[PDB]
Amino acid sequence: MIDLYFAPTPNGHKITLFLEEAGLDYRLIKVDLGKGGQFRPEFLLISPNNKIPAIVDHSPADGGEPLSLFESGAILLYLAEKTGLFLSHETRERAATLQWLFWQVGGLGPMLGQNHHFNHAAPQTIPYAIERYQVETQRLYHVLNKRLENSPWLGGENYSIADIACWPWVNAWTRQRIDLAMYPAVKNWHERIRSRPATGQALLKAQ
Amino acid sequence: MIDLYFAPTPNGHKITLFLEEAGLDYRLIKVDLGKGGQFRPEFLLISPNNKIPAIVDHSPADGGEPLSLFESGAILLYLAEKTGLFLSHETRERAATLQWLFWQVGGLGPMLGQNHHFNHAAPQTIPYAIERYQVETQRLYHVLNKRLENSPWLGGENYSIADIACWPWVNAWTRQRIDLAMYPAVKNWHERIRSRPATGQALLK
Ligand SMILES: N[C@@H](CCC(=O)N[C@@H](CS)C(=O)NCC(=O)O)C(=O)O
Ligand SMILES: N[C@@H](CCC(=O)N[C@@H](CS)C(=O)NCC(=O)O)C(=O)O
Ligand SMILES: N[C@@H](CCC(=O)N[C@@H](CS)C(=O)NCC(=O)O)C(=O)O
Ligand SMILES: N[C@@H](CCC(=O)N[C@@H](CS)C(=O)NCC(=O)O)C(=O)O
């Protein structure tokens, strides 16, 4: 059994996507980010960075005590290694998959997140910052598009945790002042993943 | 033989740290970020995100063609898996190590980088943005400090790629307007890593 500490956000959806694709049983535990649920002492023991997603794995491979883990990328990697699913063991595909996973964690997520912040959450309109993250958002979509023009999926011929990590952020394009049609390979890939049954199951759970 | 495409930056130093700690032979290939070396077509083939670090591994495990890789975190993980060094195979320590490695890549690096930008590189002074990333930098140091109060190293009892990923960023604490003495466990950990012989070799280049 996996407990998933969750809020309906791009980083939360990464994990529901994986769990639905892998067919793992899990319990969704809602953390109310608006009311400071992420700062509760009992939650900080699981997620000392005060963020979701976090999991608690009640059946770890070593047969021991529940295993807690935060960082969506570490969770995806952990679950992929545990299940043998959505991450290749072959060195080339595995390397390419990890490359794009870390690119999402270090680039796509953080920068699109700043885009969201300065456009929607900041109490003042700051054109320099808005422009900075807008240009960077476009750069990232351009990089993503160029890769997806060259391969069906980010890591190679198989859907993987790299695609799973990127999709919920691309799915938020509507908030990012991006025209997704300007990136046709991203658009088609986004649509393709949206049409997978597990993706629909994950979104319905978010409700 | 590993080719390392490099600039003297926190992310560049992650990989020299690893290579020196692991005792791997490598060639340093300088990419001039100031002159747009990261946009050269031949380099974009290796690093399509137009950034350093990137490596080319000329003796990959599969015996095949040179293997190119970008993202400092993927490079660390790749080299750790290849060598068996600085990443545990035991499931608990491995999970904790990966947790803090991803935390660095998604949090410490990006936010301290924004701190650097708005304080030193931006052509205008933007107090809201400076404050946002200052506060977040403080938060990240507080999280890092708390973990280091509870464990000698980020992933457990052993130095790992998680520590290696974080250190060059902490080593830039002066640029971040952070008082490292406010984070005593970070301060001691920073001093400890600085004193390791490989660290000195990496900085010396
Ligand atoms: N790098 C982290 C980012 C996680 C993250 O940003 N979580 C947000 C929700 S999407 C959060 O919990 N924010 C709470 C807060 O900042 O107080 C990951 O990939 O898991
Ligand atoms: N404390 C955050 C709250 C907002 C938040 O957590 N945003 C998430 C998206 S739900 C984010 O930007 N995560 C960045 C990432 O995933 O790396 C802020 O001020 O930006
Ligand atoms: N997430 C990336 C970040 C790498 C990065 O920010 N590289 C900088 C140097 S530290 C770079 O090459 N900048 C060139 C540019 O942005 O044009 C990683 O961990 O490797
Ligand atoms: N294009 C970058 C140029 C400066 C740069 O590459 N900064 C690196 C540090 S050398 C950075 O902040 N990387 C963020 C990370 O490592 O995630 C910018 O405008 O911020």
Side-chain angles (χ1 to χ4, degrees):
Chain A
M1 194 53 176
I2 292 110
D3 288 342
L4 172 57
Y5 291 83
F6 175 90
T9 65
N11 294 317
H13 293 310
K14 292 178 191 176
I15 313 310
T16 50
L17 254 72
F18 182 98
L19 294 165
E20 293 293 334
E21 287 280 356
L24 291 182
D25 295 317
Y26 65 104
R27 167 169 48 182
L28 210 58
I29 301 165
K30 300 267 174 96
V31 179
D32 196 325
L33 303 182
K35 291 169 153 193
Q38 69 274 38
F39 302 106
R40 280 170 305 115
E42 52 272 44
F43 177 73
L44 291 170
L45 292 176
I46 296 168
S47 187
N49 189 47
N50 68 251
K51 290 184 187 283
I52 62 87
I55 63 165
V56 174
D57 184 355
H58 294 278
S59 67
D62 63 3
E65 295 169 0
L67 192 161
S68 65
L69 188 58
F70 68 100
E71 287 297 322
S72 63
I75 295 165
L76 286 169
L77 178 50
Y78 173 81
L79 293 173
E81 295 194 322
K82 183 179 193 199
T83 59
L85 301 176
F86 307 108
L87 177 62
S88 179
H89 297 174
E90 185 272 314
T91 21
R92 307 261 160 187
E93 181 176 349
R94 184 184 182 82
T97 298
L98 296 173
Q99 181 178 260
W100 291 106
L101 174 63
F102 277 94
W103 172 84
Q104 186 284 310
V105 170
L108 192 70
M111 294 295 108
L112 274 48
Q114 305 322 292
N115 176 324
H116 292 184
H117 177 76
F118 283 100
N119 285 276
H120 304 300
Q124 38 189 278
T125 297
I126 305 178
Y128 176 84
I130 285 165
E131 172 73 350
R132 169 174 170 85
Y133 295 112
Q134 197 63 35
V135 173
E136 176 59 12
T137 295
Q138 294 170 353
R139 195 193 62 86
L140 290 159
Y141 271 89
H142 173 85
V143 168
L144 183 62
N145 195 64
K146 293 290 279 198
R147 174 57 180 163
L148 293 170
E149 286 180 342
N150 291 352
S151 184
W153 303 110
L154 291 171
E157 297 293 315
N158 306 297
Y159 187 56
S160 78
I161 54 179
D163 306 281
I164 292 168
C166 291
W167 185 86
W169 277 102
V170 170
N171 192 55
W173 71 272
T174 60
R175 299 187 66 202
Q176 293 154 20
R177 292 177 30 237
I178 281 299
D179 184 5
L180 198 59
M182 295 293 92
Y183 307 96
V186 180
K187 182 165 182 295
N188 290 342
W189 166 97
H190 169 260
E191 182 185 298
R192 186 179 185 173
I193 290 166
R194 179 59 181 90
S195 293
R196 295 175 70 92
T199 305
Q201 288 144 218
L203 292 174
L204 180 57
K205 291 245 165 96
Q207 279 178 47
Chain B
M1 191 56 55
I2 301 292
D3 289 341
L4 173 57
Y5 291 84
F6 174 90
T9 66
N11 295 318
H13 295 310
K14 292 175 189 176
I15 310 310
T16 52
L17 250 72
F18 182 96
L19 293 164
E20 293 294 334
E21 286 281 354
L24 289 181
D25 296 321
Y26 63 101
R27 167 168 49 181
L28 259 193
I29 301 165
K30 303 269 180 87
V31 179
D32 194 331
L33 303 181
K35 301 212 148 67
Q38 67 274 41
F39 301 107
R40 278 171 304 115
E42 50 271 60
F43 177 72
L44 290 171
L45 292 177
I46 295 169
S47 188
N49 190 49
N50 67 250
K51 292 183 190 285
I52 66 87
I55 62 166
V56 173
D57 182 0
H58 292 279
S59 66
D62 64 2
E65 293 172 353
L67 192 160
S68 68
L69 189 58
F70 69 92
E71 287 298 321
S72 62
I75 294 164
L76 287 171
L77 177 51
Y78 172 81
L79 292 172
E81 294 194 320
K82 185 176 192 198
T83 58
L85 301 176
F86 307 111
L87 176 62
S88 180
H89 299 170
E90 185 271 313
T91 30
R92 308 262 161 185
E93 180 177 349
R94 185 183 183 83
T97 298
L98 296 172
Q99 179 178 262
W100 289 104
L101 173 63
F102 277 97
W103 172 87
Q104 188 283 311
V105 169
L108 192 71
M111 295 297 107
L112 277 46
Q114 304 320 291
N115 179 324
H116 291 186
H117 175 74
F118 282 101
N119 286 279
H120 304 298
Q124 22 185 315
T125 299
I126 304 179
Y128 176 87
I130 285 165
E131 168 78 349
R132 171 171 170 83
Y133 296 113
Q134 197 64 35
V135 169
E136 173 59 14
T137 295
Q138 289 169 349
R139 193 192 65 82
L140 289 158
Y141 271 89
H142 174 88
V143 169
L144 185 62
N145 196 67
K146 297 300 284 194
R147 172 55 179 163
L148 292 170
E149 284 181 340
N150 292 352
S151 185
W153 301 109
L154 291 173
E157 299 295 313
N158 307 298
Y159 190 59
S160 78
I161 58 179
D163 305 283
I164 292 167
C166 292
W167 186 84
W169 277 103
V170 173
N171 193 54
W173 67 275
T174 55
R175 298 190 66 203
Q176 295 154 18
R177 293 184 305 112
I178 279 298
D179 182 6
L180 206 57
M182 296 295 309
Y183 306 95
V186 179
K187 184 164 184 295
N188 178 248
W189 167 96
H190 170 259
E191 179 188 330
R192 251 186 287 142
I193 291 166
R194 179 181 65 197
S195 298
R196 297 173 70 91
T199 306
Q201 285 304 293
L203 296 177
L204 199 76
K205 283 168 271 116

